[model samples]
Target: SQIPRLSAINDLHKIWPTVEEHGAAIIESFLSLDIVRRLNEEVDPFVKIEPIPAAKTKDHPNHVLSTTTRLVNVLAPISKAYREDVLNSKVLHRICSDAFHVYGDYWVLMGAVMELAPSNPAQPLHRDMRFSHPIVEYLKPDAPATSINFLVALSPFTAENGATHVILGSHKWQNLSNVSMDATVRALMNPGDALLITDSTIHCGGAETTGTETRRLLTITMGISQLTPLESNLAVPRPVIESLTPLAQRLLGWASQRSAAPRDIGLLTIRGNSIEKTMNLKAEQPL
Candidate 1:
């Protein structure tokens, strides 16, 4: 018999709910090994020629290598294999549903890769939702999660190579002062594994790469439908958006509009064979 998948749960329904309860969860081998292999080959060349800059610190020569744009759109046209794996993932949809209660309605807030250079400092501990400014205090104690973050390991996320440090269950914390170091733990994962976190969870990218290789991660952030995306999908050429599936189009914000139909219903109906929902709206205004 083969060894079981680590973290033990592969079902998305089970996985995201558990993350809701625990503030985070790991999906072992979330991407297929082949996809992982191809992504590395695809990203490495671009990273070498046109390296991305790190925003957090200036203490080191270069802290994180990142990209100027979203990887989804950038890679989609170049690699059909990688595009299909990311766009058509049932697990991603299910996790989206669990995180937002309404799947298609959410938007990709930010999507980019972060490659931590050797000797990079650990990122400051903070909540992804903290970007909203003083919003945490207004949320109900039992507020449904408004955002979901996926950190997909492009390289092995090991202790030596700076796996992220999460303040476990800190998503439930009402005040920043209440957070403590004792609650922190590392998210050790393999190349295909992913760390799924609720937006409110306190966490940080680990500091320092004692290991020889660079640590790379594909960071994905999805937010509630109502908020503006950190990066506007409109920036992507219309021709590129036209080539994507309806679901991908909606995710990239081609379908974000207040129509005669409810927003949730509009998003849910955008999938499969339905183009009318989007087409009818497009006639009135351009995406």
Candidate 2:
């Protein structure tokens, strides 16, 4: 007695390919409600979320980071399922093909939340610039911008919930519009909708209406890093790199070197049978 809808194409093999071939497309049901609920439980409480001084505008004082804010590097070992989710998303790898080699050596996941209050002005409309140069320089398709931005919406992004604003294809411009109090766009979407955005485009979070619900989203941003020599300096311990799985270590910038046989070193990448993948897929479905 369920309505007919293309919830998911069952084209797991093609999700990334389609996104790569086409600029973007929505995944009918890319995530489960349970996963969304669990992720929410795992993060800071709704009221406990704090604001980033960098994102505040005088005209819009209510702008704050969503409850989902956290750095992915620090979260790798939180759970086995979380780790697998990080390793298994093929779509991320394809969209960030070039940047994963340039900027941070690889794209790093950023768990962020966007909370906009009614008094807050809509987020200033502007392309993401943090990963790029402050000089307002433009990048070619292959150049590293911020890489791909994939957001798994925990709740429906409606006018009341504070949707995101984005400019289509704006990443191609050399001289993009600078962040102005008035510049902004609205990126509205339904629950569980996956928006695969290019790194070079312009976008911002709109202000939330005076309502009880807060906008929450799980953002995974990845890109290539040009410098790889800092592995020892940036990591907790240089040997930590030696302990990760090929993929996990790659993310931590420690996956490349290997001899014929593998040896166990104390690394975050160490996996055991007890590790579980969160968001259990349906019996016939592939996650």
Candidate 3:
């Protein structure tokens, strides 16, 4: 499924096809549907469980619930089987590649969960890069304007309830001007469905429905493996990281040898190639 495009965009069609072909998917019962729906009903969707800000806009009905938790790090200890699963998966490769395009250092899961309330006026059509890139410049950061995002839907989404909207070729815009396409499309989905969006595309966190259920998504972002993340991933404490396996430790930058090489490793440290520069894995580490 090539991402459809009809504009004067360049790499506009580059990732659209990748997304159309391998972007979003539905994982029936990916998590406990009964528990998820129950969480939506019993838990306050707007409880502000995370330190990040909720999606906001001047015009639109915006309702959502979100939190961040890393099963990636913890999974390493719970089951090395699962640890090997994520690293070997095609999704892991894509996320790594996407993260490399922007920053030369580590990926950021950003926040854990992004829960959506029914339709609202806040979610204007846009891309994650639109926000991240500017913030990088504002902070005089050395990071690139790239990021790989994955949205794991916990509930069903429909057109009427305002599912996510995207413009196939928006990422290739010559100028960094934001636009809500006149012909935007909704990403109707079901429980366990996964949406892999790139920095090269434009999208939005759509409105949830007024029905008995709320829309749920676990948002994961990836980047290179060397740099510090904008999120709170590093705060997980050393004991937690030491408890992970080789693969998970590498992803979290805990086992990387970049720092051992030099203080200023360069922008491509995450994608750098050099056996000597690589970090030493724990001697007792298992696959």
Candidate 4:
């Protein structure tokens, strides 16, 4: 199961078509290695490998990951490269728009600047959309995906250092009873390369045995705006949001165009405008 690899990172013509068939693909050099280096430098201090007392005491399942990994919790706020370079890029915006085109508009669904350290075990294989909705159909091709994911390798992604494991064609399978560990394909990638997957794809983080270096990847998942996001995008400081592109703000749930009914325009500010106005609050206009 070789996922289609794209030579041109921003080519939607190839990307969307490949996604329709394979449920997963790789965009080579989605960002330049220089940008990958900058992104790594930006989030290195914030990513944690320390155990959390609360996670342990609360018996949270994610507690185990604390020993080996931590998402850069403050990624968007602190990393201008992520906010501007990644979010503001045409490829990202286009992919998000195309993924949820049938569902109207979209927003940030989840994320990570995951730091997979030495000897981290593989995660369980699962479909991302199950968190928000129970998939009802089976034995057929996936309906238009409600979400899509972009995972950019910040370091070399290989089986020895926990490259992602994806089961190709799993999106079309009606039966989950036959999934096997050996059936998984390693999504081998280089720094700056991105693994693009439909939300319906069955995939997992791989186990890391080689202790030579830490495995890191920047994760970005966007979905239809109506779905509840795994990470709340609004808690970041207002000034931080202000620094982003208008499109970036939209990705963070600032736009107001996801219509549910004729009379009920949802997610609006006091005067029925976008929250962008509040973030800007500039004196250039009258509402």
lDDT value for model 1? 0.65
The C-alpha stretches of model 4 lying farther than 4 A from their native spots are: 49-66, 129-141, 259-271, 277-287
lDDT of each: 0.65, 0.47, 0.46, 0.74
> Which candidate wins on TM-score?
4
Please, what are the lDDT tens digits per residue for candidate 2 over residues 1-287? Answer: 11112234465445544444333445555556665666556554542544443344334332233323322224343333333554445544544553343333353544344333443445555544444334324445545344566666767876666676655445554565454433434445666666666555566666667556666666665544332221121433433333344465455444432211234231222352111122121121122
Better of 3 and 4 by TM-score: 4
Q: What is the C-alpha RMSD of each candidate to the true structure, in Å?
A: 6.6, 10.0, 9.0, 4.0
Each candidate: how many clashes?
1, 26, 20, 0
Query: Compared with the true structure, what per-residue lDDT tens digits does model 3 show for residues 91-114?
Result: 445445543533444445453455
Query: Per-residue alpha-carbon lDDT of model 4 for 43-108, expressed as tens digits?
Result: 877775434423554443453244567665446776778877887777777766666666677777
Error of 2 at 172 (Å): 2.2
Residue 48 local lDDT, model 4: 54
TM-score of every prediction relative to native: 0.76, 0.60, 0.58, 0.85
Residue range 1-287, candidate 1, lDDT tens digits = 11122343436557777777778888887787788788778777665554344334433223322333113324444444444567556677777866775433576776656666776667778787555435645778787877788888988887777788887678887777866655678888888788988888888888666846678887778777666665665566655666666666666666643222344344334554344464653321222
Which parts of model 1 are misplaced by more than 4 Å?
A: 1-9, 49-82, 102-104, 132-137, 257-287
Please state the error at residue 21 of candidate 2 in Å. 7.9
Candidate 2 Cα misplacement greater than 4 A, ranges: 1-25, 45-73, 77-81, 97-105, 113-121, 131-146, 175-186, 227-245, 257-287
- The stretch of ten residues in a row with the least summed lDDT in candidate 2 is 273-282
